[model samples]
Target: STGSATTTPIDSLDDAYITPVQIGTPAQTLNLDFDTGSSDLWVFSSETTASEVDGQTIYTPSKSTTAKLLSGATWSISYGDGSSSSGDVYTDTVSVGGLTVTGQAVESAKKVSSSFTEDSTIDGLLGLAFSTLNTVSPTQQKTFFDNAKASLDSPVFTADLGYHAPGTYNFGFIDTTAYTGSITYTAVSTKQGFWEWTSTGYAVGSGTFKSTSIDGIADTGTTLLYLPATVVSAYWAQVSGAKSSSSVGGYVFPCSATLPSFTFGVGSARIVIPGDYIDFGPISTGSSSCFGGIQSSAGIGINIFGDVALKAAFVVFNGATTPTLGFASK
Candidate 1:
């Protein structure tokens, strides 16, 4: 497993909620989601108007110490959540962990949907995954990795989400001590422009083996770990002890006994996900089913090791020397 701690106060909402990093040095405070699935740094700008923003953060150039519009490069993206945002290109200073990078490529929203418009606190996203999906190319465009890439001592970075109050979002360096030496790593494989890999198989009940094996990606934007339908069914078959049951949106298992621990194989690394995750809230089927942490993706053809899985180990995406994923306990 991994380290655990109760919520504690370390920083304020402004300090803990968002860290500002300069992009293109002064064009705008590119609020970005430190996504593990893709590499990009983008923000919603004043041009987007207040109505086109949502969630919790917004960055205004007028309040920025140094912000400027880049012009020419425009961008837009839509998520599965049915939210969309579009914006003009701009460059400015972007900072996180007080680490600054100049000439960082960024996108400023020219237009956004109401889902993104309402939240003044929520603005843009910073992707901290890998270099393969960097939104800004070498053509002088910038990304969080493009700029922060040079600042790290190891040419590597890590995203550590604090669970409690004033959670710290780190950058630039990887804390080696945070992990046990039993780390396992894998080389990168680009699929659909996003780096992906295959899961050899999984285990439960004291790390015992199961026949479920599938390919998947590691994404930070998503909250729950998702498995293909076949994998989910196969996994539940073992957990349910041959008892037939109904399925829910989230993985639900029968709450008869303590849910077995499920461990997934990512290359040489074996990630063990606790049973509490699978034992989600109960259902009305009268069978006392538990929610399997691994939900069905409805044949998305890819599995996603989302935040739930990431939280199980210390994950490091090393793009500096080579694109690789390292997982261990910190």
Candidate 2:
């Protein structure tokens, strides 16, 4: 089966993309972040304390006739950013873009970190990562994509993330019409449960392309591009007034600084991220300093090609056989 869903960007955050998903027999619709970085379809629910939940839409499993409690099963997850959630489990029907997966494990949050509790708009997280990363006690759960893949025409999905614009996530089929030029395929190593790949080379603007290989992950949940410190320093050197500030966190440059374009090689294809996109808006309100969209991946062992980098092209997550990634201009 083939299905497609509309993805919209979070206005002020400019960090995450959200899409609507239907759950249970009566189909309670909730807006969920389509995260490719982790596996576990989780949501705020009736199990969560009312005081802990802000304005997010909570799924009341008790109301769904098809919802069944998975006794003695539990799940908990923590992100690199320290945000976390945990709760009991339930089996129910979950649908995305008209594609339905019956008896899918849905982790309903009984407790959420302050980060999630404060994010009122985000009702849940729909993980598109491999099923092996799913978190469930007693028995590991399968993600919606995993459960639906067997019956799909092709076990693949495409992420067309746009900058400050609406995009589409197509499931089970690749839409050639969504991208331009020829798509380049790259082998992915999923030993770590991520769409991990290595870039053959990289460069700042039109400068010399470094032959150094860089290992990284394509994480839709992450907001910024993270690379080695040396690579980050090289790019910031091109900015007139760029410096790493403790208060501002990553490297900060003058808001009016002329930023250079960043490019990374994916096999034989070279994807260029525009200079404007490298400037991740301003650091704070009324501040003349802005944070570079690309930061040093110091503490985080692996480089992350987050939304800032992924939005520059059309990406395909191939689930058939050995997983591969296809990239093309959009």
Candidate 3:
């Protein structure tokens, strides 16, 4: 079966994108962050600590007739920014858009970090990353996408994230009208459990395209674009007031600075990110200096072509035996 889901940004700065999902037999709908960089589909449920519960919604398995607890099964996952969540596992009917999957592992959070507890807009996280990265112990669980791929018309999903509006995630087949021109498909190495692809070239604004390869992950979970220090310096240099501020963390500049566009190539296809996209937002509550949407990946361990880059183009996460990624202008 084919399925389509609309994704919406939670905040003005596009901190995260959430997609609606239904869980259990009775189908309690919740808005979940669709994280392509994670593998555990965890939710804040009845088991979560009371103090950790704020305005976020919880998934109660007891309310669902079809819910079955996985004996002795547990899961724990962490993100780059030190955010973490851990819980027990339950299998139930889970639905995304119009597609439904029975016996899908729905993780019930017993504990969560302050970062998650404070984010009232996010009820849970639905991981779409490779199954190899699943955190469930003893018998590893498959991701929602893995379980549903067989029933899908095609074994692929496309991510069309918007800048400041709602976007769509289409499963089974690519939408012909969703993107313009031909999609430039390239090999992506999933050995490390990420959409690891090498961008052929890059350019700052209308400047020359530097013919070089830059390896990075197409991470929907990450909020910013993180590249090599040299690449980040080149882009920031274009702005008069921009500086790599250690005090504020990463790069920061006056909110009034004139930003430049960023361009990266997927084979011959050129996806350009608008300068306004890099303006990002204030470093703090009402600070005049804004943190850059793009930053250096110096100590980040891995380079990331995150939401800041993904929204600039249509991205196809192909799940074939020999995996490949497709990029196209929208």
Candidate 4:
């Protein structure tokens, strides 16, 4: 009924979330990112050069169905910090949560960023962004949903993320009974290939809602909540012991501090993020300094409503011709 996450924070700031997926017929298990930021379902597998392989499970094409390699095809992407990955492409069968799709584009890593080797658990990513954003060259491959949507009962998906209990990613239909009140939906701007939307405004723990438009993305791949610098500063000020340390690069506090809850508006719906969620976790195994889940999006360009905000509400991603995103209380 639920999917699992990694055991611990890889660092003070980010966490990679994943669920087990069956890559081929015998269902060789691999845990991957259901990332919404970019569109390209890539993996580290048998096709990956030995020099680039480390700390990751491999996907064997021989065990899977008859695979067709897209000759001359290559895909590559950067983390904008020079950290990047690229590889060759092939068509294979893939399955997740009893949903199966044939002839799905599965990119194999020929070269991976060294940083990724440290996190062995993330086999690869299932990009949920629009097809236009896919990195494949010579032949652009659509996302898994494009191939599976026609068979689905509905053209939609829902994210019910959790902290303690493992969360779920439900496909095709929305589970009305899973949430409270009504879903407040907003138009999604796909021009940039991100599930980008604008928040009505925000409120800090028990404070009144501030009315202003804040553009951001419902990015499942990102673990932290990044807001405008001014707004982020406002929230951090309420915590008596909090500090946005230049050395640490984000907000940090003593493990014992009580954190204020964060709430952001989606249409008329107000989703509240628990204060406990903001406490996040301690910076290091031996360090007493805890890192805040919410931080400033100062140099990040766009504000991001990542998993920190996502775990607090039931999110519906409606893939209608004119796509829209909905939020509801739980």
Candidate 5:
């Protein structure tokens, strides 16, 4: 049988989706962010300083009878947003939905950045990227999906992300009922430890699709979609009052501005991002101005097809063979 889990959006941020995961023998359930950008299952724990723990739930391994310490093993990870976490390792039974993996590496965060500490809603992150990126020192660790794949009917997982709505993540099998139309398959490069793929081109609104090649990663942890500076500028140009605000750090426009749809081509399929989605809520509390969801990935070197982009399509993270991405409309 296949395992499945529900993912909910964070209230105000609406940035990442949190899924419930049970760890250890007796089972300590933690709300974890399933991140495709990173490969480390680090969580807030008893090892985390009390002052730093704040309102988040901590996983206590000592309380679990089956918890085993991978002595001398440690892990440290930093995100593109500058958020960082580091900790020692523990081996325990981890379960997601009905699937369970014994002896999975669970990183107990002894220290976390202010970004993570301040956001108390997320207890930890479940890395869905390839196991090659696992950061455990001395010896690397495998992800929950990696350990459970062999037991699955098929090595595949589907990410059905919704816009401001609840969604479901299915493991081991694909649910055809969750999506419509045929899934467009594209080759992925796992060399970067991410589900990296190249887009044939993109178009603004009803404009013609360009033929430029765009390489990016499908990252569920990130909130916004990032493209090249030129592409971003071209998109904002269509909006009357849209401007690249240094103060806002990206592009921003008046709330009343009429925005156009953004489309990206993957193989023969064209994934269109709604104009309303590009507005990306507000830049700050009680503000009339909003930040553009599509930003420039100049300094970052790699573009990111964040939640804003992924939510537009039904994505399949296929682990079989060379690893492929299948996309379909919801």
Candidate 6:
């Protein structure tokens, strides 16, 4: 699923604290993004000059003797968020939680520039969006999961994202212990590599789920949900005292009050987002009270279900086998 994304705190845009694991080894702290939109693991390269790359956590190859670099394959990626990087490929033992996958494909970027610099908490992204949408070129490629599949006992990896203290983001060969109930899969409505999906309808809190089907695309690379103006207005209405002082933005009152929950239908599946995320706290932009979360993308066209929404569920991207989104709860 190219559009799917999970929210995780970053050390900075260029680097993230990742749990780098090798076969039979304990997981170590390494920064990474939950990026499914693209493939290829990228780190600040050895060639990265101090001036060209900023706020990056260079992968210490010395820390892992087994790491190997692919000689001829080089890559660069520019994201819609105005971030860009380029690097060579490498393979090594990588793991999250107790799951260990060997020969994971990764990139070591020579340059990086993006919003990553603003956040000192983020390090890098672990792209789980989709292989087809991978930033790496098809001609020279391999994905972290593609290489790990052969060794994983379940042949699949599950991400359990928790918001509680030490908010956990776990990945492994489907740790049945973490699951409280059954897991389910959503049939992917394949379009381009964007993980474009059609929703049965859209609705604000308590409002009738509109039959006006909307397009849903899950994205990790993006941070906010960009919806059509009409739909956005319809949603804001449920926020009690929400007001639109500026045509571009709006505001809501009683931040503590529970806002409306939004639900999107994807065939038989209904993904619900809590009101807090949808009706974020108030903001004052030039004397105009504005609401968070509901920003204006104006003409972005498609609706993006960013981390604000995906973080609430256990998402599975079955790209190696089929294009599907597996949902679960712990």
TM per prediction: 0.76, 0.98, 0.99, 0.93, 0.98, 0.76
Q: For model 4, what is the C-alpha lDDT against the true structure?
A: 0.82
* lDDT (0 to 1) per candidate: 0.58, 0.90, 0.92, 0.82, 0.90, 0.57
What TM-score should be assigned to candidate 5? 0.98
lDDT of 3 by residue, 207-305 (tens): 999988999999898999999999999999998889998888899989888889999988877899999887778898899998999999999889999
**What stretches of model 4 exceed 4 Å from their correct place?**
1-14, 80-82
Over 47-101, each residue of candidate 5 has an lDDT whose tens digit, in order, gives: 9977788789889999999999999999999899988999999999998888888
Candidate 2: tens digits of C-alpha lDDT, residues 1-86: 98899999876546788899999979999999999999999999999978879999989999999999999999999998999999
Q: TM-score of model 1 relative to the true fold?
A: 0.76
Residue 31 in model 2: lDDT = 91
Count clashing pairs, candidate 2: 2
Q: Encode model 6's per-residue lDDT on 78-102: one tens digit a residue.
A: 7766677776666666665545556
Better of 4 and 5 by TM-score: 5
CA lDDT for candidate 1: 0.58
The alpha-carbon lDDT assigned to residue 119 of candidate 2 equals: 83
lDDT of 4 by residue, 70-150 (tens): 788999987533567898998888877878888899888888888676677788888887888999998899898777787
